[PDB]
């Protein structure tokens, strides 16, 4: 180890943890949580950004003086990728869009970019690579999102054989899509569900658990070239999950069955927006798809993290969606949803 990479302190804000990490996609949900945990440890963090610098302001307080470094980056520019991974011994990849824009596709953001990041990082001598994939990453999956996820996972494993591929199920948190996507269907009358959501089983995972698992993957020497599956402790049907979401948000729950082709056309309607779409066809497919069971792969209990149940952290996300009449209602006022274990 270099004399400047030896850990010192008590793992506080002003300590030295010996970790120099370049976090791609640090300007998002999982990105902000991972950067916060690294800065809390007292690590050196490099944040490649392509957006407006104003949109990276929430990441400034997360580390001490000089512990957060912001650099521009393209994604199609291996020179920029080398510039941002040149001096770091850990490279974390959380780049990804749930939709497709004019300039970037699912092939671009899930196969081309991760492969270039892994290829450059291998040349630059980066010791550790963490790559975030999806739990339902199937090559023959109906969703192009998941097809590209599987292809990019294979490409990353090929380019950087000593990688840690993490496969979260469905991350819920304050800034997530999942709980907010289900809780924002108040505006469109009722809740459209495919087969009334009785044929879909999901086990969401908590954002803090995912970030802690990513951190512990860096600090574990026996997770170098592995694949993890981050899942929650309980599995729910989609109908019961959405019903519990609306119960906690204290909104009237009016489900109705919508045929799959009709839902696909509805999703096609919403994806014409130049801005961030409310829903897309791939989002509809991913919501309908059941979470896979992967008992062979390790998980949070193996990385040392006890998974947080949804019934303990749902009220953080869903209290914002309540009205004035129900803002002050307590956490225990809603009976937990029916699980399928």
């Amino acid at each position: 180890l270099h004399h400047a990479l030896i850990p010192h302190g008590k793992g506080g804000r002003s300590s030295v943890s010996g970790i120099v990490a370049t976090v791609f996609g640090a300007t998002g949900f999982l990105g902000r949580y991972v950067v916060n945990h690294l800065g809390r440890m007292g690590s050196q963090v490099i944040v490649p950004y392509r957006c407006e610098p104003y949109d990276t302001m929430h990441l400034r307080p997360m580390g001490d003086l000089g512990q957060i470094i912001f650099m521009e980056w393209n994604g199609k520019d291996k020179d920029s990728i080398r510039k941002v991974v040149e001096h770091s011994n850990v490279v974390i990849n959380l780049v990804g869009r749930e939709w497709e824009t004019k300039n970037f596709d699912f092939e671009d953001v899930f196969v081309k970019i991760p492969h270039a990041i892994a290829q450059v990082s291998k040349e630059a001598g980066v010791e550790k690579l963490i790559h975030i994939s999806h739990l339902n990453a199937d090559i023959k999956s109906p969703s192009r999102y998941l097809r590209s996820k599987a292809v990019g996972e294979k490409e990353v494993r090929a380019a950087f054989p000593e990688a840690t591929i993490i496969k979260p199920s469905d991350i819920f948190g304050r800034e997530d899509r999942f709980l907010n996507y289900f809780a924002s269907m108040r505006w469109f009358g009722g809740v459209p569900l495919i087969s009334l959501g009785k044929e879909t089983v999901k086990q969401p995972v908590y954002i803090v658990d995912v970030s802690k698992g990513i951190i512990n993957a860096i600090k574990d020497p026996d997770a170098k070239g592995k694949t993890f599956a981050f899942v929650g402790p309980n599995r729910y049907l989609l109908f019961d999950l959405v019903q519990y979401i609306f119960a906690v948000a204290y909104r009237p729950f009016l489900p109705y069955p919508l045929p799959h082709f009709a839902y696909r056309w509805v999703g096609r309607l919403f994806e014409v927006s130049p801005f961030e779409p409310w829903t897309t066809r791939d989002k509809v497919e991913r919501v309908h798809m059941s979470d896979m069971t992967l008992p062979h792969l390790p998980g949070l209990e193996d990385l040392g993290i006890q998974a947080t149940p949804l019934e303990l952290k749902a009220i953080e996300v869903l209290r914002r969606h309540r009205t004035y009449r129900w803002l002050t209602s307590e956490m225990e006022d809603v009976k937990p949803a029916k699980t399928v274990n």
Binding site: P7, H8, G9, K10, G11, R40, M41, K313, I315, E316, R319, L327, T328, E330, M331, E332
Partner: protein, 114 residues
């Protein structure tokens, strides 16, 4: 040596004051969770009250017990009057502190701390 008592004279009256303060704190946790919009359970709050009471269970001086219940009444009135914020109430729970290792081998691995 005779010393001026703050309250409670002997130890039994100090224990009586302790029980009164514990009841006052026990009946306040639901209102605190409701007003501050805490995401914790009422059971968690009562458990934290119990734990904070138990860390002083080794005191044998009635004057020290009287001072402890005086400070407990102070920090209870800071909560009933909503002078405290959610920040302080959650500071009671150390929700952000990383778990320090306690075994010799882990402490040896991390650093030089005794």
């Amino acid at each position: 040596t005779s010393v001026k008592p703050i309250f409670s004279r002997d130890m039994n009256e100090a224990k009586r004051r302790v029980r009164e303060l514990y009841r006052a704190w026990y009946r306040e946790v639901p209102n605190t969770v409701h007003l501050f919009q805490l995401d914790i359970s009422v059971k968690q709050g009562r458990d934290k009250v119990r734990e904070m009471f138990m860390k002083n269970a080794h005191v044998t001086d009635p004057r020290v017990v009287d001072l402890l219940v005086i400070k407990g009444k102070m920090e209870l009135e800071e909560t009933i009057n909503v002078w405290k914020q959610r920040t302080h109430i959650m500071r009671f729970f150390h929700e952000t502190e990383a778990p320090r290792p306690t075994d010799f081998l882990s402490k040896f691995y991390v650093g030089h701390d005794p």
